[PDB]
Design an enzyme around this catalytic site. Sequence first.
Site, PDB file in Angstrom:
ATOM      1  CE  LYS A 174      -3.981  -2.173   1.945  1.00  0.00           C
ATOM      2  NZ  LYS A 174      -4.994  -1.987   0.875  1.00  0.00           N
ATOM      3  N   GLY A 175       1.846   1.299   0.853  1.00  0.00           N
ATOM      4  CA  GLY A 175       2.672   2.492   0.998  1.00  0.00           C
ATOM      5  C   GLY A 175       3.399   2.827  -0.289  1.00  0.00           C
ATOM      6  CB  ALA A 176       5.536   0.803  -2.480  1.00  0.00           C
ATOM      7  CD  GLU A 230      -0.354  -3.318   3.015  1.00  0.00           C
ATOM      8  OE1 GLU A 230       0.592  -2.791   2.371  1.00  0.00           O
ATOM      9  OE2 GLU A 230      -1.228  -4.138   2.513  1.00  0.00           O
ATOM     10  CB  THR A 244     -12.737   5.497  -1.876  1.00  0.00           C
ATOM     11  OG1 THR A 244     -12.213   4.369  -1.139  1.00  0.00           O
ATOM     12  CG2 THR A 244     -11.705   6.638  -1.775  1.00  0.00           C
ATOM     13  N   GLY A 293     -15.714   3.094  -4.838  1.00  0.00           N
ATOM     14  CA  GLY A 293     -15.617   2.432  -6.093  1.00  0.00           C
ATOM     15  C   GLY A 293     -16.195   3.375  -7.187  1.00  0.00           C
ATOM     16  CB  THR A 339     -15.836   9.205 -10.370  1.00  0.00           C
ATOM     17  OG1 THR A 339     -14.853   9.341 -11.392  1.00  0.00           O
ATOM     18  CG2 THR A 339     -16.173   7.791 -10.128  1.00  0.00           C
ATOM     19  CG  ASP A 373      -2.944   1.381  -2.415  1.00  0.00           C
ATOM     20  OD1 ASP A 373      -3.388   1.759  -1.225  1.00  0.00           O
ATOM     21  OD2 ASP A 373      -2.654   0.110  -2.621  1.00  0.00           O
ATOM     22  CG  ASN A 426     -13.564  10.622  -7.300  1.00  0.00           C
ATOM     23  OD1 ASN A 426     -13.318   9.694  -6.543  1.00  0.00           O
ATOM     24  ND2 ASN A 426     -14.643  11.420  -7.142  1.00  0.00           N
TER      25      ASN A 426
END
EC number: 2.7.1.15
Lengths: 316, 316
Positions: free
Chosen positions: A44-46, A144, A225, A227, A246, A259, A285
Site C-alpha cells: 500500500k505504501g509504495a 501494513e 471511497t 468504487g 465520478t 492507493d 477520482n
Amino acid sequence: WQEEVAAVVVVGSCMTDLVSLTSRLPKTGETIHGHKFFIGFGGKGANQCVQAARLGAMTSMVCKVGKDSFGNDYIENLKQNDISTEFTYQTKDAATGTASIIVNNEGQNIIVIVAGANLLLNTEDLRAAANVISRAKVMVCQLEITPATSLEALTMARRSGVKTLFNPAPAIADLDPQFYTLSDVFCCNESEAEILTGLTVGSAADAGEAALVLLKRGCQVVIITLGAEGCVVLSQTEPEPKHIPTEKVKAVDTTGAGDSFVGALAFYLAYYPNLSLEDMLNRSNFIAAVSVQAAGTQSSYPYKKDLPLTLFLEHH
Amino acid sequence: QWQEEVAAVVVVGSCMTDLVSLTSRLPKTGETIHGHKFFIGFGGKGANQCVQAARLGAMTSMVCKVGKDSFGNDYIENLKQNDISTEFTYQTKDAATGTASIIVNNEGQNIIVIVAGANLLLNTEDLRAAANVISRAKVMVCQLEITPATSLEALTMARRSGVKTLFNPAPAIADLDPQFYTLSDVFCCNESEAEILTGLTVGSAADAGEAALVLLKRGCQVVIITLGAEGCVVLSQTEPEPKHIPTEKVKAVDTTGAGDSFVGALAFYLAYYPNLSLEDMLNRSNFIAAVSVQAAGTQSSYPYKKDLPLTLFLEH
Ligand SMILES: Nc1ncnc2c1ncn2[C@@H]1O[C@H](COP(=O)(O)OP(=O)(O)CP(=O)(O)O)[C@@H](O)[C@H]1O
Ligand SMILES: Nc1ncnc2c1ncn2[C@@H]1O[C@H](COP(=O)(O)OP(=O)(O)CP(=O)(O)O)[C@@H](O)[C@H]1O
Ligand SMILES: [Cl-]
Ligand SMILES: [Cl-]
Ligand SMILES: [Cl-]
Ligand code: NA
Ligand code: NA
Ligand code: NA
Ligand code: NA
C-alpha cells in the site's frame, strides 16, 4: 547547496506481488495449474508513493525490505519512479514482504500476505528520517507495518506541523484511538469503514453515516471511497456528507485504485494546497479512474505527461 | 573428451521455483490471510529427480527450459551447486520460469498453484541440440511436466541409441498416447497416477498389482507403482507376477518429493549398477526415498552418498 526537499513522505509497506492466473481457485490439498505467472510491485505504501511520484511529487519512501533479490529489485523500482530511497532500509533478518495472489478468470482471488521485513521497520529507523519528515508537506501512513511505527511517524509529522494522511488499510475493528486523533485526513473504502464502525456500508448515504462516527472519534476530515460511486467526504467544519461522483468508465482492473486515489490526494495536498478539498477529490477520482482503465496495479498508475493539463492548474 | 566419464543420467524435464508461504490456516475463496514466513525453494519433477541422482554420485545433465529472468538464473545456480551439467538448460525470454506457489498451514496441509511457464516451451529443436548428450547416456528420464510431445521425442531419441528409458507419467494424463508405453523400458508411477491411467480403483498393494498388469500389457517392459509407506510393487514382461517390495517403517516429517527421490535413485542404479537385480535396485530406492521423507524441504531433504549407509553402494 541544500537541494529540493521531498514534499510527500510515505512511511509504510513494500511487497513483492507473486501473481498466478488460473481458471479455478484451489481448495485444501489441491494442486492446480494456471496459465500465467508474473511478479509485480505492490504494498500500500509504495503504491501510494508511486502514484504521487508519477504525478510529479518529490517523494521519499521510508520502508524496510530484505537484503535479497526481491528487496534489491524493489529499490530499483522506487528509483525508476524517481522516489528517494535514502530511508528505504534492507535487513537480513527477514525476507522482503510478499503477497502471493492467485486470481481466477472472474477476478476472484486468494491472497497470502507475509509482511516480513516491513514489520522490522522500527522507531530508530524513523528517527534517522526526522529531518526529511520535518521538511515534508504531507506524511502518508497505512496499517501494513507495525502499528507502533506508524503511530510514531504520525506523531513526528504532527510535531512539525506536517499534514497527516492516514489510510486505515487493511482495517481492524479495535484500531488504536490515536490513529483518529493523529489524522488530519482519514481515507478508507466501504469495506474498511464497515469494519471500523460496525455499520453496513453499501451506498453513499450509508458511507455518510459511517463517516460521521469516524469524525466523532477525532478525525478532522473523513473520506470514504466508494468504487464507481466516487467518494463521500465530511469534516469537522462541514459535517454534512458531500458525495463526489465520478464519470462512468469501463474498468479493466480496479486493483490498486484506492492507493492511486490516496497517492493523488497526497500530491494535491502537498503541491496545490489552495484547491478546495472538493476539487482535490474530483481530481483524485479522475486519476484513480484512469488507473481502473488499465491492467495491473502500479503499471496502471498514470504519469503526469499522459494526463490532461487541467489536472495541474489552479482553480478556474 | 571421448574416453572420460560423460553424463550417464540425462533428465529431460521440468524445473520450478517453489514460492512458499507458511501460515496457520489455508485461505478460501475471496480471503486474504497472513502468514509468518516466506521462502524460495527449488522443485519441478525433472530437477528433483536429477538432483537425487547427482547426490548419490551420478554424473547428470538437465535438459530443461527456464526463463531469462532472476528465478531462471537462480535455478541454474542451484543445478550447478548440485554438480549437474546445465549445458542444455535453456533460457527464454518468452515465458517466466516455471513456478509453484505453495501455501502450507501448521499441520502441513497445503494448496499448490503451478504455472509451468518456460517448461512448456522446451521443444524438439532444443532436444536436437542435446542429441549427442542424450545418445551417450546410460539412462534417460522424463516425466509429464513439459509438453508431452517433447518427452515422447526424448524417449524416441533414447531408444534409437539404445539408451535405457525411465518414464514417470506424472502428473498423469488420462488419454496418454499409447506410444509412451511402448517406448518405456521402466515405467514408474504412484497409485493415484495408476488410477488415472487405467481407470481402476487403486488404494492397496493388491489394487496396484492389478493396475500394473494393465500397464504392462500396453507395452512397458517393467512397471513400478509406488505406494507411499507400503513401498512399491513391480512387474515385468519377464516376470508378470506382482512383487510387493515393502519399506521399513519410519516416522515421516514431510513426504513431499518422495516419488522424485525414488525415481532419481532408480535412475542412478540403472545407470551405475546395472548388474543388480531389479528387486535390489528397488529395495535401495525405497530406502533412499524413505530417508527423504524423514526431513523437511523437498530437494533439501534428498540425501547425499556420504550420509547413506555403505551397503547401498556395494556391487552385485
Ligand atoms: N469502476 C470504477 N469507475 C470509476 N472510478 C473507480 C472505479 N472503481 C474505483 N474507482 C476510483 O478509485 C477510487 C478508489 O476506489 P476503492 O477504494 O473503492 O478502490 P479499491 O482499491 O478498494 C478497488 P474496488 O473499488 O474495485 O473495490 C474511487 O474513489 C474512484 O475514484
Ligand atoms: N511414509 C513413508 N515411509 C517410508 N517411505 C516412504 C513413505 N512415503 C513414501 N515413501 C517412499 O517414497 C516412495 C515414493 O512414494 P510415493 O510415490 O507415494 O511418494 P509421493 O511423492 O507421491 C508423496 P506420498 O507417498 O505421501 O503421497 C515409496 O515407494 C517409498 O519408498
Ligand atoms: Cl488456467
Ligand atoms: Cl492498532
Ligand atoms: Cl523401440
Ligand atoms: Na485502499
Ligand atoms: Na488498474
Ligand atoms: Na511422483
Ligand atoms: Na521430505
